[PDB]
Structure formats: structure tokens, C-alpha cells
Design a protein around this ligand. Structure first.
Ligand SMILES: Cc1ccc(-n2cc(-c3ccc(S(N)(=O)=O)s3)nn2)cc1
Ligand SMILES: [Zn+2]
Length: 251
């Protein structure tokens, strides 16, 4: 599969034609205030430098593989372990977030993909209710170099070629996300690439993460994908809610 053309994703995986897909357009006025949505809790995200982590250009994103021991809870008894994180972005003067807010597309987006502690492996969790959970935050331009992001972005030149990888020192993985874990939207949807399995709990933070202009340009201008193509605009079009109601943790 690829962004932009064939093969049609439903031929790759029938689940890509499900009724309840991601990403979606978030309309805050239509979101349901749900006070059971408590602040997200992360444990073990502050990593030592060794052992190193693998950072890979997989042709459709840059993905950092996360080690064992990163625990995340959506609430009491809703426990998960982090597997990996990756990014979605646009191109010179064009935004490339997956989720939108009232039609607004943000420059870029981070996804941190987690596996329910009830499952030993991802393949067993695919399509099961709440088997996977993704934390999603928008990346916007701020005035300062983001030092946590710089640790990844400074290494993209080493992995410019499709299918290449490098090792990076461990870092505070929570520093790639907003400091506000209280205010967010949450809904049930799908993986945004094949196999597009449903039952995924998506949490999209209110607060955004700030990268420099230079950093955003590095993200979108360094990596190459399938063929001789720049790896850019690597986002799926928004999918209709089709009757799902997005919940918000704040009125
Ligand atoms: C055997 C196996 C191993 C890994 C996967 N995984 C697929 C994925 C993902 C696809 C799309 C996303 S995303 N853009 O966050 O929704 S995460 N994450 N793990 C699926 C099957
Ligand atoms: Zn993603």
C-alpha cells in the first residue's frame, strides 16, 4: 500500500472500508462532555540513554520503536503498554495532520500506539474493542527549537532513504507530547493505514506541541518514500463520523 494511489486500500484490507474509520474531523461543539474522562497517566516514559531505540524510515512515516516498560492508562483499569510512535506531516506551505479541528489541518501530528495489557501481541488485539489505543497530538510552529524533537529530527538525514534505520539514545518520550494530559477528545475508530482495523481508542490532545519552522521543514523535506518520491503529505483523508459521538474531557 501507499499514499496517493493504487492499490485501493480495501483490496489490501477489507477493514479499510469499515463504517467507523479514522482519522476524523473534530467539531468541538458537537463533542460530548464526559467527566469520567480523567487525566491520562504515563509511567516509565523517562528513558535512560542506553539501550538505544530504533528509528526507521519505513517509506510512509518515520517510526521510533519503544522499549518494554512504558505504561499508559486511559483511566482506572484501562491499562496499556506503548509500542511505537510515528509522525504524519505535509510539505512546503501545506499542512499534513491526520485529524482536523473544524476543518483546520495542523502542520503535523504525532501518534503513540499502545497495546492493551490484556493482549500479548498486536495481532491478537487487531479489531478487538479497546485492544489498541493511540495518543495523538498536533504539531505547530513555535519560536524555539523543541529539544526533545531535535533528538529525532537531527537524525533524519541518516535515514533519508526508504527502508533505512538508525539507533538513537533513549530520551523522555513524554516530552514529545503536550504537558496538558487533562484536556482531550476521545473516540473509537480505526488504524489509519492498512489493515485499518477498528476498535482503536483515539485520544487527541487539546494542547499542541511546538516545533520551530526549521524543525517542521526538516521533517517534511528530508525523507524519501516509494519510487523516487519525497516522503510528504503522508496522511489519510478524514473519514465521516457516521453517527459516532466524540467525547471531550472538558465542557
Ligand atoms: C503483526 C502486526 C504488527 C504491527 C501492526 N501495527 C500496525 C500499526 C499501525 C498502523 C497504523 C497506525 S496509526 N497511523 O497510528 O493509526 S498504527 N501499528 N502496529 C500490525 C500487525
Ligand atoms: Zn499514525
Amino acid at each position: 500500500w501507499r499514499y496517493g494511489g493504487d492499490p485501493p486500500w480495501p483490496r489490501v484490507s477489507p477493514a479499510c472500508a469499515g463504517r467507523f474509520q479514522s482519522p476524523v474531523d473534530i467539531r468541538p461543539q458537537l463533542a460530548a462532555f464526559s467527566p469520567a474522562l480523567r487525566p491520562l497517566e504515563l509511567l516509565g516514559f523517562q528513558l535512560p540513554p542506553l539501550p538505544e531505540l530504533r528509528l526507521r524510515n519505513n517509506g510512509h512515516s518515520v517510526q521510533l520503536t519503544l522499549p518494554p516498560g512504558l505504561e499508559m492508562a486511559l483511566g482506572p483499569g484501562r491499562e496499556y503498554r506503548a509500542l511505537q510512535l510515528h509522525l504524519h506531516w505535509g510539505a512546503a506551505g501545506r499542512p499534513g495532520s491526520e485529524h482536523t479541528v473544524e476543518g483546520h489541518r495542523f502542520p503535523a501530528e504525532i501518534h503513540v500506539v499502545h497495546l492493551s495489557t490484556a493482549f500479548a501481541r498486536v495481532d491478537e488485539a487487531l479489531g478487538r474493542p479497546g485492544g489498541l489505543a493511540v495518543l495523538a497530538a498536533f504539531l505547530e510552529e513555535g519560536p524555539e527549537e523543541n529539544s526533545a524533537y531535535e533528538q529525532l529530527l537531527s537524525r533524519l538525514e541518516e535515514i533519508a532513504e526508504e527502508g533505512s534505520e538508525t539507533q538513537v539514545p533513549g530520551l523522555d518520550i513524554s516530552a514529545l507530547l503536550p504537558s496538558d494530559f487533562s484536556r482531550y477528545f476521545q473516540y473509537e475508530g480505526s488504524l489509519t493505514t492498512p489493515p485499518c482495523a477498528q476498535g482503536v481508542i483515539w485520544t487527541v490532545f487539546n494542547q499542541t506541541v511546538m516545533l520551530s519552522a526549521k524543525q517542521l521543514h526538516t521533517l517534511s523535506d528530508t525523507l524519501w518514500g516509494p519510487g523516487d518520491s519525497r516522503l510528504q503529505l503522508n496522511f489519510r483523508a478524514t473519514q465521516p463520523l457516521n453517527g459516532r459521538v466524540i467525547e471531550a474531557s472538558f465542557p
